[PDB]
């Protein structure tokens, strides 16, 4: 119920939206650090994905933190120090000391505090980003009472963007971390653009006349404490109210009680049987794998050929063994038709095809509108028919500088007459004279006997509807075969035995990557089981077969006797014969429907209130 912030800037009101971001796990075993004069503990904590800094302040002890990789003037590091005058944020190669501290001196003659020692960094060589805030005055006084202010900070380092969420909440607890819920909001975004893996807290050092000795021993430590958390990426539900502030949150990985709210998308859970998931690990990284034939596809020649074939004989070229960069295809701003049936041009950079076929011919303006799947005319019926389930689209543009000469260009011949309707993706080259009446037409060209091929009149001053338009037809095929032609997307490294969502040759799913000993035929690419789910992956970058282990595989039934009624729930495992369970718990009972934990068993026989299965009934009693 702590560390919850706004993961997006989109305003939501009375809508529960599931988020997958770096969030603080519920009831985590966070580390506790204490600094009591009576313990100046300033360790270096690892920065895996994010650290939630929980600390309560009563005398302005904690000032800032040091962020970097090595902190030895060898890599780029981020400095955050909150002095008594201004706030200094710099990105330089600082040489940080072993135990950095800020020294504040106190005078017996006059009750005033003034920082005197600044021992944080030795020197800075090269600086990239520097931030200076407005000046302000802080009293920097010591309090003999209990804690008053609590400061919460969330650190995130994604794609070089440093987002810090802070919130001030007044508390009166002495030592224990306060409970309840808080909402955190961004205040500034820092484009540091560096890799940070280690960090250390920077406190304030107080000196006065009550601590005799040298500089290294003559000092006292203020009464302060802080806690260090970890941001594990887990799915969460956040309750966005009408004011835009999150008043409560729902976990999906702490307990089966929490995950029941996650599946139902509601904060209140009534009585019933719910199936959320088995023992489930939230995904942390993401992987994409595509074939690595980094070769440009040759459609730049088909779109720029020196000459184009006729309509009755359209040249078709197979495109394969290359990556198809469609960014130079739908962004040319020089074509005239891009109605793409089925798939969308925005998804052409993601999908993978078995092979790409590119037809080509030249057509007039009036017949460029009738090359859709369901259409009729003298072209779609006799010359070029697309299937009703056609994938891909035609591309046409004006051809007046080329293929347009005075006196008429009669080189092309379209099929004006034909005996029957044309089958889809069929090319007809036949010059036999078509007859109409019962008179024989054995090669004659008399009455009721016309040449099936009619020439075209292409003049530079002809009408726009009769201008010759160069038409190229891209067709995509999806067959049970490895995809030799894919989008220009790259491929990351391959991970194993970890619940990681994957992107294999255009197929996206979440699971655990495990080695498979099954022998896979070269014709097939994907393996499907009886349940019709993905089981085998070819992985064309390495050409090895991996078995997809589901992250959740067993059946879990959560016996929840309401939310306000009781906070105790029972977990029933269907595939477990009482381990791969959420928790061991107590009162483990094995029934015919499976293994039930968290619920007691009695030898009596009462009325069935909450059925379990196979005659087993459970109820909430005293």
């Amino acid at each position, epitope marked *: 119920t702590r560390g919850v912030y706004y993961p997006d800037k989109v305003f939501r009101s009375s809508v529960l939206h599931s988020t997958q971001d770096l969030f603080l796990p519920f009831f985590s075993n966070v580390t506790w650090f204490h600094a009591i004069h009576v313990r100046f503990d300033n360790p270096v904590l690892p920065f895996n994905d994010g650290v939630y800094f929980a600390s309560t302040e009563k005398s302005n002890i904690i000032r800032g933190w040091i962020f970097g990789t090595t902190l030895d003037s060898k890599t780029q590091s981020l400095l955050i120090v909150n002095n008594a005058t201004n706030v200094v944020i710099k990105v330089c190669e600082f040489q940080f000391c072993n135990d950095p501290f800020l020294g504040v001196y106190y005078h017996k003659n006059n009750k005033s505090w003034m920082e005197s020692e600044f021992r944080v960094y030795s020197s800075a060589n090269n600086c990239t980003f520097e931030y200076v805030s407005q000046p302000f005055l802080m009293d920097l006084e010591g309090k003999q009472g209990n804690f008053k202010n609590l400061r919460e900070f969330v650190f995130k380092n994604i794609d070089g963007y440093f987002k810090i969420y802070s919130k001030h909440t007044p508390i009166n607890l002495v030592r224990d971390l306060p409970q309840g819920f808080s909402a955190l909001e961004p205040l500034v975004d820092l484009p540091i653009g560096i890799n940070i893996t280690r960090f250390q807290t920077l406190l304030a050092l107080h000196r006065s006349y009550l601590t005799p000795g040298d500089s290294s021993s003559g000092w006292t430590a203020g009464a302060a404490a802080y806690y260090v958390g970890y941001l594990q990426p887990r799915t969460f539900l956040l309750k966005y109210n009408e004011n835009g502030t999150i008043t409560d949150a729902v976990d999906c990985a702490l307990d089966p009680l929490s995950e029941t709210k996650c599946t139902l998308k509601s904060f209140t859970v009534e009585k019933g049987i719910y199936q959320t998931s088995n023992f489930r690990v939230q995904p942390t990284e993401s992987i994409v794998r595509f074939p690595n034939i980094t070769n440009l596809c040759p459609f730049g020649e088909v779109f720029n050929a020196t000459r184009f074939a006729s309509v009755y004989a359209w040249n078709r070229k197979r495109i394969s063994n290359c990556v198809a960069d469609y960014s130079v295809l*739908y962004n040319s*701003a020089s074509f*005239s038709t891009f109605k793409c049936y089925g798939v969308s041009p925005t998804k052409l950079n993601d999908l993978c095809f078995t092979n790409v076929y590119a037809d080509s011919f030249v057509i007039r303006g009036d017949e460029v509108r009738q090359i859709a799947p369901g259409q009729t005319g003298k072209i779609a019926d006799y010359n070029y028919k697309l299937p009703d389930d056609f994938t891909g689209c035609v591309i046409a543009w004006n051809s007046n500088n080329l293929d347009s000469k005075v006196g008429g260009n009669y080189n092309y011949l379209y099929r004006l007459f034909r005996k029957s309707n044309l089958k889809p993706f069929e090319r007809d080259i036949s010059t036999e004279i078509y007859q109409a009446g019962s008179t024989p037409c054995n090669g004659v060209e008399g009455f009721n006997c016309y040449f099936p091929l009619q020439s075209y009149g292409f003049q530079p001053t002809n009408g726009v509807g009769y201008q010759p338009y160069r038409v190229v037809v891209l067709s995509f095929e999806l067959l049970h075969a490895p995809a030799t032609v894919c989008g220009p997307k790259k491929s990351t490294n391959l991970v194993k035995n970890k619940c990681v969502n994957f992107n294999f040759n255009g197929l996206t799913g979440t699971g655990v990557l495990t080695e498979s000993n099954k022998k896979f035929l070269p014709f097939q690419q994907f393996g499907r089981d009886i349940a019709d789910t993905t089981d085998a992956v070819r992985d064309p970058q390495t050409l090895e077969i991996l078995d997809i282990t589901p992250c959740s595989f067993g059946g879990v039934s959560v016996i929840t006797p309401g939310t306000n009624t009781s906070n105790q729930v029972a977990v029933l495992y269907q595939d477990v014969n009482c381990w791969r369970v959420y928790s061991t718990g107590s009162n483990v009972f094995q029934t015919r429907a499976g293994c039930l934990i968290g619920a007691e068993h009695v030898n009596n026989s009462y009325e069935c209130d909450i059925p379990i299965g196979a005659g087993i009934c459970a109820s909430y009693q005293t």
Partner: antibody
Amino acid sequence: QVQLQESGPGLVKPSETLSLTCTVSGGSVSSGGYFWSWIRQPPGKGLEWIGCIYYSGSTNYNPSLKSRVTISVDTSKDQFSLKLSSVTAADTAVYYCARQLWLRGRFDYWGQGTLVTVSS
Amino acid sequence: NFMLTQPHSVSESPGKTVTISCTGSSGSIASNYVQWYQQRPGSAPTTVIYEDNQRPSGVPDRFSGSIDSSSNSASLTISGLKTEDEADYYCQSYDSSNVVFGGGTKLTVL
């Protein structure tokens, strides 16, 4: 997600220079190869398309309002602006800036409607 | 010289269907797709129907779209009207180095 927030004064003198700056936050102007464009609409009338831009310097303009618009992309500030010259009294309209997922695709994400009025 | 023509104002009783037609002037309508927008007053227009009949997330199933190359017109059909459907409607298509729009059909309910 990503959103577009417009800026610039709403009071322009006739036959002067107009300067509107649409700032995009939560995303990258150069990355993705997305087309940024401008759309205006007179009050009570239909929408009018002004011009489109790429992440490079390539620009497309409407033929009716040609030789009056100059849109540029500032990748350092992650914003794209517009420059209108010789503003007439009929140019009083709500100006919009919209990202395009595709060159001839939908203006999927729109900015808030800013009011620009031509008055002396 | 391509422009889109639609009726200026089309109104219908609630509970029935209504058809809004967008017709091109010179060029064909079967190329470079079409887009439908709904502009609530005092707000930016939002996409309702894109592509032939594709619909973005957050748009009800009542908004149905179809094309007609023979009539050179694009049709948007709304069934089961509501108070929130009272807004300006626009049709958008693409031409050579320019994007075209329409006059704007003002739909009124009740």
